[PDB]
Design a protein around this ligand. Structure first.
Ligand SMILES: *CC(=O)NCC1CCN(C(=O)[C@]2(Nc3ccc(Cl)cc3)CC[C@H](N)CC2)CC1
Ligand SMILES: *CC(=O)NCC1CCN(C(=O)[C@]2(Nc3ccc(Cl)cc3)CC[C@H](N)CC2)CC1
Ligand SMILES: [Mg+2]
Ligand SMILES: [Mg+2]
Ligand SMILES: [Mg+2]
Ligand SMILES: [Mg+2]
Lengths: 5, 233, 233, 5
């Protein structure tokens, strides 16, 4: 699952 | 609310304690209380709010994904309504948390946020919580929920490009998350990749202006952009 | 309760889903519902109940320890009542969970448990949840709470030694936890060490009787006994 | 913190 902040 | 009798400063103090104790539901409730005092939030306070809800909804999203996977496999023996019911329960709780955060943003954090750093941060959050609604949406409003995320992210992007340097961590994090929106929600992987790459390259070229501490902050988020690009290409 | 309208089998099914989703508060609520149907629990169902509440209270205990440490350091600048208040909040929630589990055991799991495996398991749980109450007790009832834990563990021990082989995992886990009670709660480290060592050695001597699968179960808990002994000596 | 089950 892709990185988010 | 339940926090109406507690001092603003005590709510903030307790939010910090809750964070140390990894009590993110409490942390979120304290920060909701603090927001509802009606005063603008400082940078540190905005970050407490975001950390708290990110952790709460992150846990919900992970659980929803587990349950949705189990439900999808069950529809490939009949085990009755329980898997759907429980996925729905978690989904409804998730939606409730998102509605709570969007409600805080609408009443009245965004409208009082005049400085770029605060306004971009809140618009990014608006995009994020509509994105989490979009992840679970399957009905008539799905397109409108997706567009609400897009519109919030786009307003944030427009302000960030005018008002902030390309290395600003808020600008970088916004771009990271909007790129993910494009890839995972809008079915626009090329847009996602273009945004991540352009954001990375423009940041690279501005690193020379930064102190050591700013450099560390910016490069950490740049690495996340690169990580996504690696995943996608 | 809130679960009164849900079928027993659906509650159990949902407890298993909640476990897969790491939703331990939900898991505990489902299992409480199942217990409140009034029927005895199978082995698998007893383990679902214990897993759910262990995880809930384990999280609470970890948070309480963080907060208590912060509070202790503050009493070595004055920051006001907030640290004590929030530690008290977490403590009261912990106590509530313990009271809920003890209530299930008293109404009416223990009194209906006639087989050694079920009765020892529930008495061990009674000892455990009085032990968690003892960890946070500071007042007039502290000695009685400690004695309630001791009495439940001792009844369990007496039945286990009469009715179960020394390698039985329930017998081993009981001994593990009672030994911890002695070390951490009763200020009896020599008793703790003697119990752990005797339990380990008696189990070792009975391993020859076991299948490969039983051997794996027993030796895992034996290793926990050894781990504690290493910590304590 | 010691092991319990
Ligand atoms: C006032 C303000 O908003 N400051 C921004 C901080 C920059 C540093 N930072 C981070 O890098 C993490 N969080 C974050 C959240 C939102 C946005 Cl838009 C960017 C960054 C927190 C630490 C993580 N290891 C990386 C992301 C906190 C916010
Ligand atoms: C019907 C019944 O009670 N069966 C006992 C099981 C034995 C295996 N087991 C475990 O080893 C863990 N849990 C546990 C809980 C309580 C007691 Cl008294 C002993 C053991 C679960 C898996 C862990 N890695 C070790 C402890 C489950 C219960
Ligand atoms: Mg729904
Ligand atoms: Mg562009
Ligand atoms: Mg108290
Ligand atoms: Mg003895």
């Amino acid at each position: 699952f892709p990185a988010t902040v | 609310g339940a926090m109406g009798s507690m001092e603003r400063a005590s709510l903030i103090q307790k939010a910090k304690l809750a964070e140390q104790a990894e009590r993110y539901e409490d942390m979120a409730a304290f920060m909701k209380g603090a927001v509802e005092k009606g005063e603008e939030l400082s940078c540190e306070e905005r970050n407490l709010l975001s950390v708290a809800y990110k952790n709460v909804v992150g846990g919900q999203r992970a659980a929803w994904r587990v349950l949705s996977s189990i439900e999808q496999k069950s529809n490939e023996e009949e085990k009755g309504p329980e898997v759907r019911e429980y996925r729905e329960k978690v989904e409804t709780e998730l939606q409730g948390v998102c509605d709570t955060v969007l409600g805080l943003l609408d009443s009245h954090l965004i409208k009082e946020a005049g400085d770029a750093e605060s306004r971009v941060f809140y618009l990014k959050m608006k995009g994020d919580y509509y994105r989490y609604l979009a992840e679970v949406a399957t009905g008539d409003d799905k397109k409108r929920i997706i567009d609400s995320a897009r519109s919030a992210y786009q307003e944030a992007m427009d302000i960030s490009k005018k008002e902030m340097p390309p290395t600003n961590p808020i600008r970088l994090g916004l771009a990271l998350n909007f790129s993910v929106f494009h890839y995972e929600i809008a079915n626009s992987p090329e847009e996602a990749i273009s945004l991540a790459k352009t954001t990375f390259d423009e940041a690279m070229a501005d690193l020379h202006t930064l102190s050591e501490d700013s450099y560390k902050d910016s490069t950490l988020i740049m690495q996340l952009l690169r990580d996504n690009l690696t995943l996608w290409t």
